[PDB]
Amino acid sequence: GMTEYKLVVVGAVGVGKSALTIQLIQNHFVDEYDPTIEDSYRKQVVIDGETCLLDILDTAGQEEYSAMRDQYMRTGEGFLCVFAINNTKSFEDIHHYREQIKRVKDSEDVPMVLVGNKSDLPSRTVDTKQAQDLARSYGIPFIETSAKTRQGVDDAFYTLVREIRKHKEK
Numbered sequence: 001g002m003t004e005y006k007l008v009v010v011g012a013v014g015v016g017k018s019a020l021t022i023q024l025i026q027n028h029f030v031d032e033y034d035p036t037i038e039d040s041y042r043k044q045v046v047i048d049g050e051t052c053l054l055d056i057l058d059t060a061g062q063e064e065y066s067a068m069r070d071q072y073m074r075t076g077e078g079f080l081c082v083f084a085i086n087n088t089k090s091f092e093d094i095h096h097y098r099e100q101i102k103r104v105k106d107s108e109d110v111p112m113v114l115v116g117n118k119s120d121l122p123s124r125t126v127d128t129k130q131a132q133d134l135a136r137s138y139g140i141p142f143i144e145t146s147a148k149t150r151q152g153v154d155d156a157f158y159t160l161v162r163e164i165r166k167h168k169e170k
């Protein structure tokens, strides 16, 4: 079979995880998607000449059993850590997602990309510089996205695939 990359999109409720995933897979912006629904989505794509399968888990936070959360973190190969540029709390939450994923995977080398979503909104409480400072500290890429206009969306997911490839070649 072609290579499949298991990606997981994490972050506070309301940041745009669903809107980002649906833009990537279906190429439309979704206004309202129930905040409590967690699903995975597949799309065949071509990234730097490689035909491959993205299998994206759009998370929604607490699970019926914590074992479920630990199971998708161990299965996931790379994680998009999303905050919204107008929600400082969602940015502060990134610390806990970075920690938790490394802790479950018991790894210091987990492919991740920091994503600051809703870049189309003039309303902003998290400046680019602050998010760059966090990404520099983690040694991972940082991309600002808009699920609404699609700006940065392919970049965020494809950069994550590229981080996964760097990890695999070691």
Ligand SMILES: Nc1nc2c(ncn2[C@@H]2O[C@H](COP(=O)(O)OP(=O)(O)O)[C@@H](O)[C@H]2O)c(=O)[nH]1
Pocket: 011, 012, 013, 014, 015, 016, 017, 018, 019, 020, 030, 031, 032, 033, 034, 035, 117, 118, 119, 120, 121, 145, 146, 147, 148, 149
């Ligand atoms: N303006 C704008 N609104 C967005 C963006 N992404 C998501 N939203 C809206 O923010 C709200 C939460 O988005 P959703 O995808 O459900 O967030 P989730 O809880 O992380 O899955 C919804 O009303 C979306 O329409 C974006 O990039 N720009």
Ligand SMILES: Nc1cccc(NS(=O)(=O)c2ccc(F)cc2)n1
Pocket: 005, 006, 007, 008, 040, 055, 056, 057, 063, 068, 069, 071, 072, 073, 075, 076, 077
């Ligand atoms: N695309 C991905 C990424 C990580 C996990 C999965 N699927 S999975 O390991 O069966 C899974 C495990 C626990 C869940 F709550 C949801 C999905 N898919």
Ligand SMILES: [Mg+2]
Pocket: 017, 018, 019, 033, 034, 035, 036, 037, 058, 059, 060
């Ligand atoms: Mg959602």
